[PDB]
Design a protein around this ligand. Structure first.
Ligand SMILES: NC(=O)c1ccc[n+]([C@@H]2O[C@H](COP(=O)([O-])OP(=O)(O)OC[C@H]3O[C@@H](n4cnc5c(N)ncnc54)[C@H](OP(=O)(O)O)[C@@H]3O)[C@@H](O)[C@H]2O)c1
Ligand SMILES: NC(=O)c1ccc[n+]([C@@H]2O[C@H](COP(=O)([O-])OP(=O)(O)OC[C@H]3O[C@@H](n4cnc5c(N)ncnc54)[C@H](OP(=O)(O)O)[C@@H]3O)[C@@H](O)[C@H]2O)c1
Ligand SMILES: C[As](C)(=O)[O-]
Ligand SMILES: C[As](C)(=O)[O-]
Ligand SMILES: [Zn+2]
Ligand SMILES: [Zn+2]
Lengths: 361, 361
């Protein structure tokens, strides 16, 4: 066999974590660029805490609070072209996966001033970048512990790239208490999918399996209560989302993530819910290769992950034309994730996965 | 509550791993110092593989193959003084815990020529150091993924310190197939203790708990067969020892490790066996603060860790005087590990832990 474990991010978790461990960012420089969403970070106390930390460490900064959900190439360039004229020592991503991923792309482009966003997809061109600090507020994408960035290209397709691991990750569960029940559900299922896909992936490793198993157990026991607003459960979900991120940082994701993309970009379905909807059906095909592991996942979730997700009210009614379905099937058949997904996926199997997922509601 | 996860070592695992991924050390420099034991690494093909790797990568080197079991301050200075006139870019530890720990100490001292071994216990003085590469051959201390180094001081006492994390760890399971049944047993129990102590420690964290649980399950299922010589079992033990190293790299150890030291330094009992002998009894006390987790550990090991260890033939007959016992009880009452160990340990309880462990056989 042959495997590798690499997750160099220094992770700090706890209430008031920026106050208690945040000063370490002073090792990164004297001026920082903060990238965050339009309003969430202003309402959960995170931006205020960050401003306090920057003031305390006497680090000057600028705030780009215009990151959109599922950020596009243009969104990133709208910030890069402007901040390339400044001189930042490091970048801080604050919020959900969108601003956290946005921060990684900007960190490279502010250093590599001659590169375009498309160039980021060429690993050979990514050799220099500003350090990145991530402060997540959802539970979650686990972006604070992965080297990935996902952007929507000019054609409207979600495309991911591998950049750098954040130097520091600061997780304060209090920031997640403001999530709506619906966002808690979607982000929680995204975390669930990361742990499940990482465990079932052909790139699975012993360390990532260990982390994935614990994450799955935590999510199974806490997601329902978290959605309802139970604080202790939300704290556990935040822990699980981080563990799951560590997992995919080793394994990457599977066809489940790839197939959910069009549901998000074309049907407005939140990322986590989109992935979660197709995941159980992708698993049915994976069974042809790893039935034991698939059985393990179903057992952890009470006997059936599909039923577990259905009980959460995850499935949505989605309008899909034959024309749209065929387009999604064609794109899925070319997903890079296919190589790391157990099972044999023909266009018909992918077509069936969508029909099954869409057929629930 | 508040926790941190940090384990930056880039870990590579697999048969012929040095041949397949070792070239990456080219990024560390052009000259290196190899520290290892007298014969071991020369008989399992590891030193041969390392020599070949260094030749292929065109990296000059010198070999210090005089690291003794449980190295002392003088041992380290012997190598340091012998090579302080030279100029190395990085250090490579090859072998078990002794040479790997030796490597970390030397890596600092060769950089900071004005420091003594005693200075290494002062975190403030350890500012710079040469990069370290670890290649373990036992399953194991997990030293390849921890920042710890343990040496025997002039007084003959085991004293550990925290230095740096190795940049790269290369694990080839084939190297462990040459271990004697006794060494497999002792190093295997050491790994078991790391996982168990890390899980039970007051410094336990979610990520380390995840890794510890998996490590414990692997060891329970494979240690007996590994001792018998089963290669699949030994390969699994090697994975577990690594996972366990990642665990203590976050948690540190408990009173069990502390109480076993005098058995090693004064009675020649191998580290793993010494810790393992007292572990079940230290756990009995822990049950006062964390009965849930202790029950979990016993459940994983077939219902009783004590019985599991006894069945391995772990316990040894040891000649101990009252004077010696009282000295150990006294020192045990002043171990830093006490603070991170659940339960209340009175001199009477510690004396009883030793009596119980020594009374088994
Ligand atoms: N790096 C990776 O490996 C990885 C993994 C999984 C997913 N992703 C990517 O991450 C993105 C998904 O991010 P996400 O699900 O965390 O959400 P998101 O897209 O970052 O934002 C979701 C929405 O929730 C809001 N929000 C964020 N934190 C909140 C809080 N604490 N309380 C209330 N509302 C809050 C946001 O408000 P504001 O806009 O006002 O801030 C936003 O409107 C996708 O683009 C996905 O492809 C990346
Ligand atoms: N850094 C940490 O966090 C950490 C954790 C646990 C323990 N430790 C420390 O590590 C030391 C324990 O090391 P250890 O149990 O791995 O053993 P060790 O002390 O490194 O050596 C044990 C003996 O086994 C031999 N050996 C090593 N690899 C072998 C192989 N593949 N086949 C056959 N024989 C082999 C050695 O031979 P040669 O002498 O010929 O090489 C040596 O004589 C202690 O000093 C302990 O305090 C450190
Ligand atoms: C190349 As990417 C910022 O996705
Ligand atoms: C202070 As140490 C090299 O043990
Ligand atoms: Zn995701
Ligand atoms: Zn040990």
């Amino acid at each position: 066999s042959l495997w590798e474990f690499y997750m160099p991010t220094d992770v700090f978790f706890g209430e008031k974590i920026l106050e208690k461990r945040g000063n370490i960012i002073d090792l990164l420089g004297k001026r920082a660029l903060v990238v965050t969403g339009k309003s969430s970070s202003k309402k959960n106390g995170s931006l205020d805490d960050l401003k306090k930390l920057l003031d305390e460490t006497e680090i000057s900064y600028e705030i780009f609070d215009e990151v959109e959900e599922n950020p596009s190439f243009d969104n990133v360039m709208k910030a890069v072209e402007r901040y390339r004229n400044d001189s930042f020592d490091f970048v801080v991503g604050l919020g959900g996966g969108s601003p956290m991923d946005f921060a990684k792309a900007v960190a490279v482009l502010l250093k590599e001033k001659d590169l375009s966003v498309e160039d980021l997809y060429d690993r050979e061109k990514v050799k220099h970048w500003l350090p990145v600090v991530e402060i997540p507020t959802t539970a979650g994408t686990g972006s604070e512990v992965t080297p990935y960035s996902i952007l929507t290209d000019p054609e409207g397709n979600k495309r991911g790239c591998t950049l750098m691991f954040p130097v520091y990750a600061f997780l304060d569960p209090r920031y997640t208490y403001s999530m709506s029940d619906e966002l808690t559900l979607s982000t929680g299922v995204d975390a669930l999918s990361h742990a499940v896909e990482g465990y079932l992936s052909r790139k699975s490793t012993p360390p990532s399996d260990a982390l994935a198993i614990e994450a799955m157990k935590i999510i199974h026991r806490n997601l329902p209560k978290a959605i309802e607003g139970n604080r202790e459960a939300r704290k556990k979900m935040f822990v699980a989302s981080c563990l799951a991120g560590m997992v995919i940082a080793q394994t990457g994701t599977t066809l489940a993530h790839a197939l959910g993309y069009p549901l998000t970009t074309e049907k407005g379905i939140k990322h986590g819910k989109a992935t979660g909807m197709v995941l159980p059906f992708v698993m049915e095909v994976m069974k042809e290769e790893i039935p034991e592991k698939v059985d393990t996942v179903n057992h952890i979730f009470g006997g059936s992950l599909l039923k577990f997700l259905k009980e959460l009210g995850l499935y949505e009614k989605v309008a899909v034309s034959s024309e749209e379905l065929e387009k999604w099937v064609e794109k899925g058949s070319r997903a890079k994730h296919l190589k790391n997904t157990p099972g044999t996926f023909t266009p018909e199997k992918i077509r069936n996965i969508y029909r099954e997922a869409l057929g629930v509601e």
